[PDB]
Coordinates of C-alpha atoms in Angstrom, one line a residue:
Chain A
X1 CA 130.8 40.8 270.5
X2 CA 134.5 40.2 269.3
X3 CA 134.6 40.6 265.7
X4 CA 136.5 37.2 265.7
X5 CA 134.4 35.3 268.0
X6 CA 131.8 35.8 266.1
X7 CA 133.0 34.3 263.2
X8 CA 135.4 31.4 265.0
X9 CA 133.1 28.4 263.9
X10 CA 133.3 29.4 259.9
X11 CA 137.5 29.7 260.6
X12 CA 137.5 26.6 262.0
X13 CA 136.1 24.7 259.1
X14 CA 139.1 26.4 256.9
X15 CA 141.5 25.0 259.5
X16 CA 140.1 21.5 258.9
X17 CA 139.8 21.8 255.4
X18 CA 143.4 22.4 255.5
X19 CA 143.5 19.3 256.5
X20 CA 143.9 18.3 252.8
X21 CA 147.0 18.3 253.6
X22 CA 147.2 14.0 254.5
X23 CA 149.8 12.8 251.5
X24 CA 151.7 10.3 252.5
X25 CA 155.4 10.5 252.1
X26 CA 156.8 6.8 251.7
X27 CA 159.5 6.3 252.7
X28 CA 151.9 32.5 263.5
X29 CA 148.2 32.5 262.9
X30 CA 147.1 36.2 263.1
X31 CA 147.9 36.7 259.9
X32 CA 144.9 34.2 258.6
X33 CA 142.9 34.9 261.1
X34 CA 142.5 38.4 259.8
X35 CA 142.3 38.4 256.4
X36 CA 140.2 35.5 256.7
X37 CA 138.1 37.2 259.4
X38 CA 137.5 40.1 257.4
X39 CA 136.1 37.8 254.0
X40 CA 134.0 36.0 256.3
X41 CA 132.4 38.9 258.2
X42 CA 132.3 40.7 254.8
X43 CA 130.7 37.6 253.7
X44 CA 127.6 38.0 256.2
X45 CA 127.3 41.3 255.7
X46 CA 125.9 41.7 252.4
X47 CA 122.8 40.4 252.9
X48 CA 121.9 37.8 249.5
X49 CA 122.6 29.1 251.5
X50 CA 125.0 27.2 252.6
X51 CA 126.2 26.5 249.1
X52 CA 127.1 30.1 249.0
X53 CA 128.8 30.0 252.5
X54 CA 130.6 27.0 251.2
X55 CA 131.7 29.3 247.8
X56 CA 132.3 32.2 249.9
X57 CA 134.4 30.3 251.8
X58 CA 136.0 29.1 249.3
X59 CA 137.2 32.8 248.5
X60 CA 138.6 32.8 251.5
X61 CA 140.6 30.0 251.0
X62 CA 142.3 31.4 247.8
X63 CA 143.0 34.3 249.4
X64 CA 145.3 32.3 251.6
X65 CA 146.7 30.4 249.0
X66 CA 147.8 33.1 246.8
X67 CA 149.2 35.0 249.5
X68 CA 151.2 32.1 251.1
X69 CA 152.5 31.7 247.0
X70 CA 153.0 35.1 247.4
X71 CA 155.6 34.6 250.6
X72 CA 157.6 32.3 248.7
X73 CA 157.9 34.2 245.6
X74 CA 159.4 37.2 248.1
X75 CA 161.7 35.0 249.6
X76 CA 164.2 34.5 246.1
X77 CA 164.2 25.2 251.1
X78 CA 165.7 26.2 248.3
X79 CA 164.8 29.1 245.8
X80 CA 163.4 27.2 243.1
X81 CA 161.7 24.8 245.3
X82 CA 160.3 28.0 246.5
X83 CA 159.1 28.9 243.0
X84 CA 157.6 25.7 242.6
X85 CA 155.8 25.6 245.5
X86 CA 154.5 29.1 244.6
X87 CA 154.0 28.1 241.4
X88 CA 151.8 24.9 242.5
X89 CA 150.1 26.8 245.0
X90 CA 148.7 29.8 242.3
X91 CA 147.8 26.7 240.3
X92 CA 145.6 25.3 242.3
X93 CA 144.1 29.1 243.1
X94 CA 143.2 29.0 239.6
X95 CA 141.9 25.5 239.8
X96 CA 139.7 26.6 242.7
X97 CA 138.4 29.7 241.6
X98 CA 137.3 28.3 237.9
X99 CA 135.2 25.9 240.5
X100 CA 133.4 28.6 241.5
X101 CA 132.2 29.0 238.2
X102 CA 132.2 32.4 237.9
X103 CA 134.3 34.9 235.5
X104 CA 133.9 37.9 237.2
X105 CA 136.0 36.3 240.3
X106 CA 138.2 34.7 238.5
X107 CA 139.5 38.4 236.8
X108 CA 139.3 39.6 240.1
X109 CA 141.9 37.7 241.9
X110 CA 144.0 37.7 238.4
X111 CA 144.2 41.6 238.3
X112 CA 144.9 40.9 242.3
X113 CA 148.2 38.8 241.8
X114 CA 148.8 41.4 238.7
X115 CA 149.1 44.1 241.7
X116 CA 151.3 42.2 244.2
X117 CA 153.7 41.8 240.6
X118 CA 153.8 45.5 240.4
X119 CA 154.4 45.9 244.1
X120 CA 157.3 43.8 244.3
X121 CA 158.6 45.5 241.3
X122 CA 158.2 48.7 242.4
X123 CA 160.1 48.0 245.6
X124 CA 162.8 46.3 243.5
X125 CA 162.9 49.1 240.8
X126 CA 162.5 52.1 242.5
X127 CA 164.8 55.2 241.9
X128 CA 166.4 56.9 245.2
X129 CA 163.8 59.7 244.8
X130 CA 161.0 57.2 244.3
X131 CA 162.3 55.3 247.6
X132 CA 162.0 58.6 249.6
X133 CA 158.7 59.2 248.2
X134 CA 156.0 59.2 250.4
X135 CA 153.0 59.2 246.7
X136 CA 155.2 56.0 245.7
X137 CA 155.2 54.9 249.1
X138 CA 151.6 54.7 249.3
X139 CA 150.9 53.4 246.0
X140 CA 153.3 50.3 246.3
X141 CA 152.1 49.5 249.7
X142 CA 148.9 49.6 247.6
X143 CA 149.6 47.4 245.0
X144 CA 152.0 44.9 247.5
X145 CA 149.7 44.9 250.7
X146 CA 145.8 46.1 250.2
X147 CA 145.0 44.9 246.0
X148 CA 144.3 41.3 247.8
X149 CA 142.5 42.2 250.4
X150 CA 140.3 44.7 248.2
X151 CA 139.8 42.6 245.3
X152 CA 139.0 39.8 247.9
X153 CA 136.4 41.4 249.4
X154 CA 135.2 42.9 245.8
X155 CA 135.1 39.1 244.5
X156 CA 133.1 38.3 247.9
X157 CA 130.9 40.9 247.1
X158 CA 130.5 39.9 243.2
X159 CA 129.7 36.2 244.1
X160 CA 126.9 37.4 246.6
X161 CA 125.4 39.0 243.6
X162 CA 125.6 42.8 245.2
X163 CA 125.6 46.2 242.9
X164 CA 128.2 47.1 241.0
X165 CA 128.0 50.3 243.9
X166 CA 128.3 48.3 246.8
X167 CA 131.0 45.7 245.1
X168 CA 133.4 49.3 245.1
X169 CA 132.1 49.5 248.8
X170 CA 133.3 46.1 250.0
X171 CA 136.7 46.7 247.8
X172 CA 136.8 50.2 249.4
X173 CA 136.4 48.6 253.0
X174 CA 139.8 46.3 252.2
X175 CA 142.1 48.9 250.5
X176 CA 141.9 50.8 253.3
X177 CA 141.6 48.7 256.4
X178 CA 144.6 47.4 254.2
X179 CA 146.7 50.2 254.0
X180 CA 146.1 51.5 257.5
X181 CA 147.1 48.1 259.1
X182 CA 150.6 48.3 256.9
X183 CA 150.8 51.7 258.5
X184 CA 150.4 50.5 261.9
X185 CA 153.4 47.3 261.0
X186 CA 155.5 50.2 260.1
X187 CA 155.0 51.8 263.0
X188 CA 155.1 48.8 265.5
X189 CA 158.6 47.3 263.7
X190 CA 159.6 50.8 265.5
X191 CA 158.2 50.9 269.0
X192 CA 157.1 47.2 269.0
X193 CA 154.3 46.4 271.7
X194 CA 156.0 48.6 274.5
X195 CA 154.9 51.9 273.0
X196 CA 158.2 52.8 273.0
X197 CA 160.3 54.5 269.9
X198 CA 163.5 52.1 269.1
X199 CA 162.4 49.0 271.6
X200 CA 160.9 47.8 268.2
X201 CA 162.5 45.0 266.5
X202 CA 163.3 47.2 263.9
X203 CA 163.6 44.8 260.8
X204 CA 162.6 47.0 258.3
X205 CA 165.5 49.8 259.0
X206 CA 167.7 47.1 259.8
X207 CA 167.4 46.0 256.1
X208 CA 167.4 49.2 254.3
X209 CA 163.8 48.9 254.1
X210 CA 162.5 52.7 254.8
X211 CA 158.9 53.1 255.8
X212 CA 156.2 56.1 256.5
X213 CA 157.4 57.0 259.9
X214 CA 161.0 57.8 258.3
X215 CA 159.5 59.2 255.6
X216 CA 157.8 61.6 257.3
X217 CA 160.5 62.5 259.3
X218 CA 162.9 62.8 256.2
X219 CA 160.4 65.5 255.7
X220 CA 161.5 67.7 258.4
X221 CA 165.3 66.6 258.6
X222 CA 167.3 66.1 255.3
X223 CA 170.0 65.3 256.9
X224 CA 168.3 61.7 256.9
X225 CA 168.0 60.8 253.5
X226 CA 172.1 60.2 253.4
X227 CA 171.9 58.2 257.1
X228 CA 169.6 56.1 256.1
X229 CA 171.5 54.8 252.9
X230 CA 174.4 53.9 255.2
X231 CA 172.1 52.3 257.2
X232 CA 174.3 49.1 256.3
X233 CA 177.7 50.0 256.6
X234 CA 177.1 50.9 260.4
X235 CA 175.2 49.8 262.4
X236 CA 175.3 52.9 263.9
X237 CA 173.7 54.7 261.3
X238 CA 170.1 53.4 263.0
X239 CA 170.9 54.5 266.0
X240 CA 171.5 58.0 264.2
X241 CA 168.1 57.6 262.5
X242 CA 166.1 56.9 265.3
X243 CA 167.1 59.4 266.8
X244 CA 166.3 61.5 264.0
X245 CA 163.0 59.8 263.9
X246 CA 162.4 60.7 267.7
X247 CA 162.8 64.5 267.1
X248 CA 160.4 64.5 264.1
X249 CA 156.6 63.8 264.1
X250 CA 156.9 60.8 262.5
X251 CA 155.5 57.9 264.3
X252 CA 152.5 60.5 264.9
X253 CA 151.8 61.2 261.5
X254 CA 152.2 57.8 260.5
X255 CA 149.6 57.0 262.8
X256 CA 147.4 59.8 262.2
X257 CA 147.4 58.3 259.0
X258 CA 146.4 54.8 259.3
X259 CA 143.4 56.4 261.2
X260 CA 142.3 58.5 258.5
X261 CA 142.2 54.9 256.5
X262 CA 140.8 52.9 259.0
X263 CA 138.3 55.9 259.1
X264 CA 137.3 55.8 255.2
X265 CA 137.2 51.9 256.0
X266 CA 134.1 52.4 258.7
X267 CA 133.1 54.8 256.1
X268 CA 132.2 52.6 253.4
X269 CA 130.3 49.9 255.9
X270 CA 128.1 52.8 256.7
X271 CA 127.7 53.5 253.0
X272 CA 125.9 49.5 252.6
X273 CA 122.4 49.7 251.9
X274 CA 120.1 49.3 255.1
X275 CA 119.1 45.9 256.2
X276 CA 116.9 44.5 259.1
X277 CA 118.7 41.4 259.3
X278 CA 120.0 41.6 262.9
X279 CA 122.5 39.0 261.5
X280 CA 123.8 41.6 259.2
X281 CA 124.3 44.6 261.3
X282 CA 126.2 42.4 263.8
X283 CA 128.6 41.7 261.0
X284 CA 128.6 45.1 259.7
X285 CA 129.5 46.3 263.5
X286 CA 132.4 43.4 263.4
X287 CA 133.9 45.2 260.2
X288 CA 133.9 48.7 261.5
X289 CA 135.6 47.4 265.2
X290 CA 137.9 45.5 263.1
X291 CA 139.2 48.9 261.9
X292 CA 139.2 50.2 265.5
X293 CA 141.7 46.8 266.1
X294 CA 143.7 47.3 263.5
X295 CA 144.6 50.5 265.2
X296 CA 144.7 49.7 268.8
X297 CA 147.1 46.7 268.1
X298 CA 150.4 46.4 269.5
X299 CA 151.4 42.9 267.9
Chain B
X1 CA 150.0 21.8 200.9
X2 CA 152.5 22.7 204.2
X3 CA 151.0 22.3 207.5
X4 CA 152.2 25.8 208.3
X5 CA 151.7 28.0 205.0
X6 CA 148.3 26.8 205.6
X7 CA 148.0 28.9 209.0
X8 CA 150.2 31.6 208.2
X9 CA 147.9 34.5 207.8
X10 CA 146.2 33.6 211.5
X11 CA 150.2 33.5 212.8
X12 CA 150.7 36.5 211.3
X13 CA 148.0 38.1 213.4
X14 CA 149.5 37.0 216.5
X15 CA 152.3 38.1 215.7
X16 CA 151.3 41.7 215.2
X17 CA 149.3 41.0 218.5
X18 CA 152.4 40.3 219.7
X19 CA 152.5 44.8 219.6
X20 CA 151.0 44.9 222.6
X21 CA 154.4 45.7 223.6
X22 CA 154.6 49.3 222.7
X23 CA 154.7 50.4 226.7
X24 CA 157.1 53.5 226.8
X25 CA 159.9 53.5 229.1
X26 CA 160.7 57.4 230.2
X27 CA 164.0 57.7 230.4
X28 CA 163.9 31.4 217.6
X29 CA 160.4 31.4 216.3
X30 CA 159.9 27.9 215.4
X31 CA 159.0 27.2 219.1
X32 CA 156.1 29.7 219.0
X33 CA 155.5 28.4 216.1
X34 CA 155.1 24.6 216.3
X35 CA 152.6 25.2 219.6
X36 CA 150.6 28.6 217.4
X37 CA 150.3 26.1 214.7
X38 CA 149.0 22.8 216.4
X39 CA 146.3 25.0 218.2
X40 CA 145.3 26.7 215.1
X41 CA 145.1 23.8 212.8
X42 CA 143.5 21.4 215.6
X43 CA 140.9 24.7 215.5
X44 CA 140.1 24.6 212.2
X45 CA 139.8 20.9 212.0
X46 CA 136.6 20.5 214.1
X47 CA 133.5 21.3 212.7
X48 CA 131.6 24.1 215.2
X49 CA 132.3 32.8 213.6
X50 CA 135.0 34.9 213.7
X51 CA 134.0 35.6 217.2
X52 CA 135.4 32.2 217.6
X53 CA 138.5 32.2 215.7
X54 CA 139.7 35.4 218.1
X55 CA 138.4 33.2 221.4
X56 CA 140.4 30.4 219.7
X57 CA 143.4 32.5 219.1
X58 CA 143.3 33.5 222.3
X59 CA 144.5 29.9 223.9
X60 CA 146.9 30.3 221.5
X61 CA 148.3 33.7 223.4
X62 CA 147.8 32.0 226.7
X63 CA 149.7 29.4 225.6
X64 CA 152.1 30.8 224.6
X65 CA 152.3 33.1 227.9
X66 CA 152.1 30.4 229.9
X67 CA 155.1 28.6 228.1
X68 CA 157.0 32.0 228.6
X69 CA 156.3 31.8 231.9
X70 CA 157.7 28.6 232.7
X71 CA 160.8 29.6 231.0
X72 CA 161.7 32.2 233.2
X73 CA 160.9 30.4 236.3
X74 CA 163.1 27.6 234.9
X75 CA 166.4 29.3 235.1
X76 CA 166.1 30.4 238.4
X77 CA 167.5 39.1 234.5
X78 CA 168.4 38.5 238.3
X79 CA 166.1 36.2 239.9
X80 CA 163.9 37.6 241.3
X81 CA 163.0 40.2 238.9
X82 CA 163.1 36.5 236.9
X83 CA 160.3 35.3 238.8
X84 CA 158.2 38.4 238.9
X85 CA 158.3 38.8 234.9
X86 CA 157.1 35.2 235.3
X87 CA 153.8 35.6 237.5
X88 CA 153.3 39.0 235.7
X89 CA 153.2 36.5 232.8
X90 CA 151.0 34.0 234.5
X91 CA 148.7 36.6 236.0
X92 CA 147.8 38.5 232.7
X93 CA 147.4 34.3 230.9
X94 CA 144.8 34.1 233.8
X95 CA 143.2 37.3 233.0
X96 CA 142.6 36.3 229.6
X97 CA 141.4 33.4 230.3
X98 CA 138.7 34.6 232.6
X99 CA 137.9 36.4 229.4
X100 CA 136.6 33.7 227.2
X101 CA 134.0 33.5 229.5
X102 CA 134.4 29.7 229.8
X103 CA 134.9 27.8 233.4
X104 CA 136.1 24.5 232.1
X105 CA 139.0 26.2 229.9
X106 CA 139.9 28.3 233.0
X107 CA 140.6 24.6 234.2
X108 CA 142.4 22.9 232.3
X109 CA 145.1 25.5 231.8
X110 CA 145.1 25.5 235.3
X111 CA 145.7 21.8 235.2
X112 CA 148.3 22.4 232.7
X113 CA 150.4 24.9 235.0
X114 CA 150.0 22.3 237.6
X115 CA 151.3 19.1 235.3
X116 CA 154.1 21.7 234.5
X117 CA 155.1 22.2 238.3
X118 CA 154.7 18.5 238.9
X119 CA 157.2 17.7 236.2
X120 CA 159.5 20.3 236.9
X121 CA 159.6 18.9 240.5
X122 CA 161.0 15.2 239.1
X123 CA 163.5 16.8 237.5
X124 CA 164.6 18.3 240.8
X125 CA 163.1 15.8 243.1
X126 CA 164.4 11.8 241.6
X127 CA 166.0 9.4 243.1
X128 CA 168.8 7.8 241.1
X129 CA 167.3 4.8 240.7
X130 CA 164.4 8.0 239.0
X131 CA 166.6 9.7 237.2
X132 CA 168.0 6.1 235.1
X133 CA 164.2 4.7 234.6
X134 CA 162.1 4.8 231.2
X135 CA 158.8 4.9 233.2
X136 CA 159.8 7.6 235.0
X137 CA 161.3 9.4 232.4
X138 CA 158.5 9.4 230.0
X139 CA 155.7 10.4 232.8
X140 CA 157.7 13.6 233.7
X141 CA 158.2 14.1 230.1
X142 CA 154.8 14.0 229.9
X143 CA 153.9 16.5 232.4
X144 CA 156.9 18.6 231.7
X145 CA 156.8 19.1 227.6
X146 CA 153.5 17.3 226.4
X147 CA 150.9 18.1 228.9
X148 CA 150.8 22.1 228.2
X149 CA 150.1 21.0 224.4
X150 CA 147.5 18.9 225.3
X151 CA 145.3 20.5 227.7
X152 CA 145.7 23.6 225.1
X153 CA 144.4 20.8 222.6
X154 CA 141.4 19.9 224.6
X155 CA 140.6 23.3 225.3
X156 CA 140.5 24.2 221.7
X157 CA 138.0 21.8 221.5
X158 CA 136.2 22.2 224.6
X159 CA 135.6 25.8 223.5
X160 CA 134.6 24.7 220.0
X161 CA 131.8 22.9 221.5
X162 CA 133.0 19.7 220.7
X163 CA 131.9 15.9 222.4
X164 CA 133.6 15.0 225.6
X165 CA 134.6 12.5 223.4
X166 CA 136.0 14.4 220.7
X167 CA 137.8 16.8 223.1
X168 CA 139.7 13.6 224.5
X169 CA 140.9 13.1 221.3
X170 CA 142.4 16.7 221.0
X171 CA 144.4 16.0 223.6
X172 CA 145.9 12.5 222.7
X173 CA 146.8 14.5 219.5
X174 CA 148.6 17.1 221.8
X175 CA 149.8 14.5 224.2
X176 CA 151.6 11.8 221.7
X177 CA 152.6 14.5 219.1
X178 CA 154.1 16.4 222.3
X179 CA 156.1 13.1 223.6
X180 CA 157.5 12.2 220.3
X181 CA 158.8 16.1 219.8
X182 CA 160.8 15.8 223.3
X183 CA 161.9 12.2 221.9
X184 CA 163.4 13.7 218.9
X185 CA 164.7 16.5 220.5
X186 CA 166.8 14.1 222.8
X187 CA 167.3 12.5 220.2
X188 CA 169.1 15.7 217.8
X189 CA 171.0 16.8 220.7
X190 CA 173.4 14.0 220.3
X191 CA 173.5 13.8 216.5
X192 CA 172.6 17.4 215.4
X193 CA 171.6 17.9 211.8
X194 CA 174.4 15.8 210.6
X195 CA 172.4 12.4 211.9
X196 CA 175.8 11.8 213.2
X197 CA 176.7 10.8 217.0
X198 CA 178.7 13.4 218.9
X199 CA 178.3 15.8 216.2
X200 CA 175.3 17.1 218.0
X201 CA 175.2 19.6 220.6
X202 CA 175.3 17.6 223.5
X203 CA 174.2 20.1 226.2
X204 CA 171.9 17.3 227.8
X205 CA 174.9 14.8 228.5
X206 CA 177.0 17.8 229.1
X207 CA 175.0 19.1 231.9
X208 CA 174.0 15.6 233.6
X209 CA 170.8 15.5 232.1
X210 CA 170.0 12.1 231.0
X211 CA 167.7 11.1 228.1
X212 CA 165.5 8.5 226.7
X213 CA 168.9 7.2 224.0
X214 CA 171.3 6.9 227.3
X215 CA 168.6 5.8 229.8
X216 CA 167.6 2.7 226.8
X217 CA 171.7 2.3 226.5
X218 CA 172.2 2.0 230.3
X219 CA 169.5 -1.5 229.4
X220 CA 172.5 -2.7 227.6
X221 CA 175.5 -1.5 229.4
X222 CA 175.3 -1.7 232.8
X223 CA 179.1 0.1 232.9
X224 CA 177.3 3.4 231.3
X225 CA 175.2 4.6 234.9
X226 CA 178.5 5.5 236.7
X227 CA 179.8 7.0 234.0
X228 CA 177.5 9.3 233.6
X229 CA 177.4 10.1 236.9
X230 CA 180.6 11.5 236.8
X231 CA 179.7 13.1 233.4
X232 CA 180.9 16.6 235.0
X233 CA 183.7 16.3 237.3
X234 CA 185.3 15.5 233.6
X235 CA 184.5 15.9 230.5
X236 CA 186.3 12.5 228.7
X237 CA 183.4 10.9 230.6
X238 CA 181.0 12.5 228.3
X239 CA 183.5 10.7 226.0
X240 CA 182.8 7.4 227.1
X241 CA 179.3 8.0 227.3
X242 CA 179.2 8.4 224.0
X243 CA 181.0 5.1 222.6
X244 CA 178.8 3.0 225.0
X245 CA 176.0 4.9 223.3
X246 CA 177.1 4.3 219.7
X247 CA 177.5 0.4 220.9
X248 CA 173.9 0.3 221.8
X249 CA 170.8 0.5 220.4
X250 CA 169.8 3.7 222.5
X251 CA 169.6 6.6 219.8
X252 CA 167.5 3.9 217.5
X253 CA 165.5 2.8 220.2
X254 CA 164.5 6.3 221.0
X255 CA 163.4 7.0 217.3
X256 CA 161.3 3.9 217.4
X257 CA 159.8 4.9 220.0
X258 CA 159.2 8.5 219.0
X259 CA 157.2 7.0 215.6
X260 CA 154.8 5.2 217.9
X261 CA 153.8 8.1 219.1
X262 CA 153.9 10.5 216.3
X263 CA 151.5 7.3 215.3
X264 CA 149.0 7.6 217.7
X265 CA 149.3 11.0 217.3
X266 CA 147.7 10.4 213.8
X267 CA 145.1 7.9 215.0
X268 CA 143.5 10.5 216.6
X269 CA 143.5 12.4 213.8
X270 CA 141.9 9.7 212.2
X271 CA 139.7 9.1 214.8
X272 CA 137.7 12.4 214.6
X273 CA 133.9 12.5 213.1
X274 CA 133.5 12.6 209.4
X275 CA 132.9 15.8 207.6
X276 CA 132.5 17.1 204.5
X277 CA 134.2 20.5 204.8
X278 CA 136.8 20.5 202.5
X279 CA 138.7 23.2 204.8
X280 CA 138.5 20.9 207.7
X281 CA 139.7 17.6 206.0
X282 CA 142.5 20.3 204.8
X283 CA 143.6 20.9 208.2
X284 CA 143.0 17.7 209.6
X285 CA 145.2 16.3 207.0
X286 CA 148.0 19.1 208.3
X287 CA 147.6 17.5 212.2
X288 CA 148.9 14.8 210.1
X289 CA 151.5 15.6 207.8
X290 CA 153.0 17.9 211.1
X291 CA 153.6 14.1 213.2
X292 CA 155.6 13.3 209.9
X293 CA 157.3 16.3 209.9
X294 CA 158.2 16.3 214.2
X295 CA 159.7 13.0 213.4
X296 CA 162.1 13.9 210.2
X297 CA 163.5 17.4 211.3
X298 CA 167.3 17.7 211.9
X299 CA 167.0 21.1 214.1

């Protein structure tokens, strides 16, 4: 029906076995829900019992772990409480994942935090033509917003004991329902739920933070580029852009891109071998709605 | 004949290794050494090829990464680009790891990142009444400097194929010769190479980090605690500190207890099954000789 719906009673065992937090001290949920959603759906729709729900689950789990260890890491209660934290949390990913005893996994969420490295340090060391870039653009959103979610659903895919052909199919699946949701965030952080260009909260231009939609539209006005990067001095300056911005196409192409994504997304579910597990299908039809979503979204 | 010469060709190696660095960019060994060594001797000096000897050099690389790692992270370059050099560091230590096709190794390295967080969070997180306590300050010590030799220990041996009982003994090697390092060191900071008091370095008492010879001085000198709380706002309290410490029985105190655990150290040593390798007596009597040698260095 809902591709969360049908997969509510396997989140809510994750949000009780978060319960492990209970240590004594003497003296937003979106976000989880759909990367969690999609590992789970993913899950049941390879098809192969409940000690493999329990380990797939368990994926799912350390997916949320090294991405929460991944929000304190960006931030840098304290910067190197932050870093510990972080630090404790990856830990304990590590600890988890050798319990699943397999290898494979294990290298597969490695390479994943390797990625998220290399995005953050390609958004920290990028030259002012690499920053403009819309090649770069795409490959650091890669690396610092879709290498978990692929490699996730790869690793749900290896522990299920699936071809090496559909393993690149789940992977496939998660880079680019990745990327096209981080297309969509760009775009709403511009016209936020009203639909409407500059009623967005507009963080990212705020903070010198320049996305696809501006980079499109620095395609068709150059006179942006040098805006942009005053963008600080003046506030001003976003006015200016977005006004820039509304002249260009943008927003559209922006958008006409996450579709193509979402689009390769359904793609690879349609790619899975057959199956006459009713069961299966459902879940299969939950992934490819989840791309239509992911579009449609205006939070 | 020295506990190092005797490993110096399998150092050498990871040295070279060490090449890996030879990435284009268009446009103090005695550390490394010390943790290299322990690992490599404690290797040779269980009886299980050179299959092995590479998947047993390879904890030596991870440790050695890991360490790194927790450098970095500790002086939190610029920060953040501190951090990220950091998990790059701890990402590729967990690659690697998945690479010796071995769970339980995966977890006790795991384990030894999280003793390394806990400690590091004592440091940061004590109470006063912590920061002056023996107890205290040998259990962070513990997990702060001794527990990544250690676990590194057991996992030579749990990759050698050793008893669980065996392996247990790895690690009290790695845990008491570990202790009684950090002991000395303490120990050197105030009386250098010139076993004199003050001559030392001092950057401990300097930056209000207090030590096993203060903390057993404050047991005799009840005046010393607010003094050394006040160690920075200037510096004739460092001064002071020092003539209490001379008074007491704190640097001695600290060396005594440093030999009890270069002891036990030993004992494990000679706790180990018998064997008539000549090669492995040879090293095992290099775990030996190195507790010997951790006790009588001057730098």
């Amino acid at each position: 029906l809902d591709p969360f719906s049908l997969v509510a009673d396997e989140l809510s065992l994750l949000s009780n076995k978060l319960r492990e937090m209970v240590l004594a001290e003497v003296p937003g949920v979106q976000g989880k829900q759909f990367r969690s959603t999609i590992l789970l759906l993913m899950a049941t729709a390879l098809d192969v019992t409940s000690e493999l729900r329990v380990r797939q689950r368990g994926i799912a789990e350390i997916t949320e772990m090294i991405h929460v260890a991944s929000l304190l890491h960006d931030d840098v209660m304290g910067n190197k409480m932050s870093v510990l934290a972080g630090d404790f949390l990856l830990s304990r990913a590590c600890g988890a994942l050798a319990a699943l005893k397999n290898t494979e996994v294990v290298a597969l969420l490695a390479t994943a935090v390797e990625h998220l490295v290399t995005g953050e340090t390609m958004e920290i060391t990028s030259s002012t033509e690499q920053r403009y870039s819309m090649d770069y653009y795409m490959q650091k959103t890669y690396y610092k917003t879709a290498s978990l979610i692929s490699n996730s659903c790869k690793a749900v895919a290896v522990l299920t004991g699936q071809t090496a052909e559909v393993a690149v199919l789940a992977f496939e699946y998660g880079r680019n329902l990745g990327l096209a949701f981080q297309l969509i965030d760009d775009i709403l952080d511009f016209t936020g739920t009203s639909a409407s260009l500059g009623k967005g909260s507009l963080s990212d231009i705020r903070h010198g933070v320049i996305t696809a939609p501006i980079l499109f539209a620095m395609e068709e006005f150059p006179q942006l580029r040098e805006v942009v990067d005053q963008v600080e001095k003046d506030p001003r300056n976003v006015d200016i852009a977005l006004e820039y911005l509304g002249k260009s196409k943008g927003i559209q192409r922006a958008r006409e891109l996450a579709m193509e994504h979402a689009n390769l997304a359904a793609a690879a579910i349609g790619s899975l071998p057959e199956t006459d597990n009713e069961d299966v299908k459902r879940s299969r039809r939950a992934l490819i709605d989840l791309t239509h979503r992911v579009i449609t979204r205006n939070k």
